[PDB]
Amino acid sequence: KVFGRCELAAAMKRHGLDNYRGYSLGNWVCAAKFESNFNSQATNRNTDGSTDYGVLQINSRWWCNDGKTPGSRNLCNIPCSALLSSDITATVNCAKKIVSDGNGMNAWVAWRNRCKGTDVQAWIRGCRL
């Protein structure tokens, strides 16, 4: 499923991401845009044998189990396939854990390269929230 920009923002707000750990909603929407372009089915193979899944491209080495990543620890305790859902609940719950893992939102390379330090409020422009 490919969400509309404001469609995802609203869904994220409903799930408590606005200002979570002091990160405004714009940051999360900007991260999803650059990580997956709002496509819940997005997957990326990593030259290292791990894979990134979903709208927030969560990694199989530590966060979810995909049954093909040597030395995986499943910290979010879910199958990675649950991250390819049109329901972002699993993605959000896992994201909250990742963002509190000690590197802030730097955990998302796309957010760091394209969102960090910019005017992130542009990302929820036109949205009724």
Side-chain angles (χ1 to χ4, degrees), residues 1-20 23-33 36-39 55-56 86 88-89 91-92 96 120-129:
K1 170 197 182 124
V2 172
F3 292 87
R5 178 164 54 77
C6 292
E7 185 195 7
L8 184 53
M12 282 173 159
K13 188 163 181 264
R14 290 193 300 265
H15 288 91
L17 283 189
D18 200 7
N19 292 320
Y20 190 79
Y23 285 106
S24 68
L25 192 61
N27 277 296
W28 294 102
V29 169
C30 184
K33 161 88 192 154
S36 71
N37 205 18
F38 308 141
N39 173 194
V55 95
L56 283 179
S86 230
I88 70 157
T89 304
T91 282
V92 170
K96 285 193 214 205
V120 290
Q121 279 169 88
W123 296 99
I124 61 143
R125 141 235 290 163
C127 307
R128 63 116 287 268
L129 309 167

Side-chain angles (χ1 to χ4, degrees), residues 10 18 48 62 90 94 107:
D18 200 7
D48 64 69
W62 321 91
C94 190

Side-chain angles (χ1 to χ4, degrees), residues 30-83:
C30 184
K33 161 88 192 154
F34 299 104
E35 288 291 342
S36 71
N37 205 18
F38 308 141
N39 173 194
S40 71
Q41 278 156 23
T43 59
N44 199 89
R45 68 174 153 44
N46 295 310
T47 60
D48 64 69
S50 78
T51 309
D52 301 332
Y53 298 86
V55 95
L56 283 179
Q57 292 294 100
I58 287 159
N59 191 269
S60 52
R61 195 152 237 117
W62 321 91
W63 310 106
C64 58
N65 174 42
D66 69 354
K68 346 178 251 185
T69 307
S72 300
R73 253 153 124 316
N74 193 189
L75 293 181
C76 283
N77 198 357
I78 35 135
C80 300
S81 75
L83 302 173

